[PDB]
């Protein structure tokens with residue numbers, strides 16, 4: 001059984017939209033110069049040659065900024081049905097959601113203080 | 115015996131095949147980044163399977179969290195730990211590999227027998243379409259303790275993870 | 283598209299995640315296998331909610347919570363892996379054995 | 383709805399925030415107190431609702447009977463005893479103390495919630511709240527490689543155990559129509575099927591991980607060596623308390639006691655725990671690892687309380703679980719106090735401690751002997767009640783194995799008192815030859831040692847408590 | 858000279874063997890804790906599918 005109305009279009013449109021890149025990128029492949037293999041295939045380093053070694057000097061600069069993002073990404077999922085259903089709930093749900101949001105605010109303050 | 119049900123069956127089996135192939139790629143492939151992206155593939159296929167089961171909110175939530183937050187986290191971390199993979203083979207390997215394979219096949223056969231044997235109670239009444247307002251009603255009537263404790267869970271997870279991944 | 287098919291699919295995903303959790307040697311792949319396992323659980327919950335308890339859907343809220351906490355446990359696990367890597371300078375799970 | 387049963391948890395919860403904001407502003411703070419005070423207030427909040435009201439339910443999602451209050455107070459007391467030990471320990475390490483006490487108090491909150499929880503979703507949420515904080519505490523000292531490997535190992539085992547427990551919970555929700563409630567599942571499924579047996583074993587797989595029943599034991603010897611020692615103290619008392627509470631509330635009330643194959647499963651696990659955790663503990667060189675295998679063995683002892691459940695095995699189990707607190711907090715406080723001063727080491731370095739520090743010896747020998755089951759001491763009466771509650775039901779073999787393992791345990795428990803007392807000035811270890819010569823550590827040590835020596839003969843006041851708690855278990 | 862020797866060899870030894878065995882049974886069973894978390898998960902998975910059979 002299936003009672004989700006609006007679906008029929010998301011599948012068909014997903015197909016027709018996924019078909020746009022795999023069709024433009026194939027039309028371009030049919031009609032375009034062939035190979036250019038020898039030295040066209042190097043990495044752009046402002047004209048010079050790659051220095052060698054080629055590492056990144058790993059940094060937690062972009063793990064913490066993804067941890068804190070996962071936290072509040074979960075927060076928004078928890079807050080969406082509260083907002084959509086704020087009519088039948090009324091009071092005493094605002095209090096619990098407010099406790100939730102205050103805890104998440106203390107979490108943000110902790111992340112912002114370090 | 116219809117055009118709607120035929121589509122709902124073809125799509126289910128297509129998504130199931132996608133799940134199986136991507137989930138085998140996550141665990142069998144030798145390169146780790148291919149696994150990191152096939153994981154997002156698995157998550158997207160399961161998000162489709164949810165929509166096919168009248169659960170439209172939780173599928174969008176999965177796409178937010180799994181293939182939008184956890185997958186990006188896993189990709190960052192897989193980049194952080196690149197050292198050209200000098201894994202030397204260990205002798206006691208075929209033992210654990212064979213044990214894992216046989217225990218997995220046995221547990222799967224056991225679960226399949228349990229699933230095909232038990233008489234589930236199908237309760238043939240069409241589900242509800244407004245599946246997000248109901249989830250909103252259950253967060254503050256029935257599942258109030260978990261909804262309230264998930265905040266403290268997230269806070270303690272943030273604290274501990276910042277402490278472990280800090281730099282000093 | 284029946285309940286038995288969804289349950290068998292979830293059990294098979296559980297199987298694959300277990301194999302990857304026991305066999306794999308890299309350290310992030312075991313976390314990815316744990317995620318596969320939690321997805322195999324959420325699929326059970328949503329199948330049961332869609333077929334058995336379809337009016338006051340209660341497997342879907344439980345699934346929302348499972349997704350939340352899988353995100354949290356991943357956020358903690360990658361931190362643990364970064365901590366162990368910062369000291370041992372590897373992720374070869376066959377080198378974290380301080381025993382005999 | 384009836385949020386009164388929560389004025390015990392929210393108090394602790396408030397502390398979690400207040401001992402956190404103060405670390406945001408100050409960063410050199412006295413949060414060790416007003417955290418002891420927070421747990422004291424949480425425990426004192428139980429007196430108004432221990433006897434005055436009847437058993438109450440939050441929304442069916444939580445219950446506050448006398449067994450719930452017992453286990454909640456037990457876990458709160460374990461956290462109170464752990465906060466005392468961990469003051470000069472994690473301060474001596476170049477780490478913060480507020481960011482540690484917040485995690486410890488959150489683990490405490492999770493353990494206290496899982497005690498009185500009677501719903502699938504909330505049970506999962508409390509268990510995972512405990513497990514995440516346990517991982518974070520295990521990997522706290524991020525400078526040592528042993529701590530990191532232990533945290534990784536513990537996380538990879540616990541997350542798999544939680545996935546199995548969640549598969550069991552999903553099966554249990556699907557077998558009985560809907561009914562995420564525990565008591566509403568017993569009413570729905572009341573017949574042994576393959577699905578019910580699979581759900582039962584999959585729940586046991588995640589319970590035994592918490593209570594350390596073999597073959598689900600292989601993480602405690604690797605976690606107790608790795609984790610900070612006060613984390614191990616909270617992990618051997620509070621985690622087992624939460625696990626046994628959840629096992630009682632789950633197996634008895636949810637899995638219809640008509641399917642008492644879990645009594646067979648737990649007989650198997652108890653026999654195996656007694657045999658292994660006491661035989662392998664006999665050949666160990668470090669005190670923390672020895673205590674890990676000892677803890678496995680003691681869990682095996684406890685698991686003959688609710689495997690013969692007869693309203694006296696439950697009381698024996700609860701009494702031993704209460705005495706185990708005094709025994710292990712006092713056995714870990716002395717280990718911490720020794721590894722702080724100079725040692726930072728294993729059993730062989732204890733040789734000759736009677737000359738340099740006699741109070742630590744008199745405090746550690748008492749607790750090790752109590753663990754062994756030596757007369758008047760808290761452990762002797764606990765074990766005698768465990769063994770008689772086992773004979774009075776019919777389990778001859780279980781008790782006759784418990785006794786032999788008690789002798790095996792007396793051996794390696796007295797082997798430490800050997801080193802602590804025997805040695806003459808020529809046989810002191812290199813750690814005692816230069817032994818030097820922190821108030822909360824001593825005031826917790828003295829308290830647990832005087833409790834483990836008096837809660838044995840002054841046991842009648844805390845037998846009525848255990849009995850009124852056991853009156854709530856179904857049968 | 859027989860009896861004493863008997864006491865020194867057969868009786869005493871018979872009382873010690875037990876102890877010695879219990880030592881060996883602990884010294885060669887600690888190796889069950891192999892130090893490999895995947896092995897621990899294998900033992901947890903061998904717990905299930907066996908108690909499910911019994």
Ligand SMILES: CCCCCCCCCCCCCCCC(=O)OC[C@H](CO[C@@H]1O[C@H](CS(=O)(=O)O)[C@@H](O)[C@H](O)[C@H]1O)OC(=O)CCCCCCCCCCCCCCC
Nearest residue numbers: 023024025026027028029030031032033034035036037040
């Ligand atoms: C009413 C419409 C009827 C047909 C319409 C088709 C339109 C698109 C295709 C055009 C016809 C030729 C296509 C052949 C594919 C190909 O590239 O072959 C390779 C040869 C390259 O020559 C070749 O070059 C080759 C080497 S190389 O690879 O190209 O470098 C070499 O091997 C070969 O000998 C040499 O000749 O290139 C061509 O044949 C044409 C390529 C470029 C043609 C672009 C036309 C632009 C039309 C788009 C604008 C229209 C607007 C919208 C209309 C709908």
Ligand SMILES: CCCCCCCCCCCCCCCCCC(=O)O[C@@H](COC(=O)CCCCCCCCCCCCCCC)COP(=O)(O)OC[C@H](O)CO
Nearest residue numbers: 004005006007008011012118121122125158161162165166
């Ligand atoms: C983010 C990346 C993607 C993540 C997720 C991907 C997964 C895809 C999502 C899965 C979609 C779910 C299954 C779709 C259901 C199909 C059947 C169906 O929806 O029933 C509708 C009807 O179904 C159909 O008729 C659709 C079948 C055709 C869809 C086939 C795809 C179209 C392909 C492109 C068009 C090609 C046409 C030319 C072919 C010769 C119901 O109609 P209704 O919305 O009006 O409700 C009331 C109803 O009308 C009567 O009560």
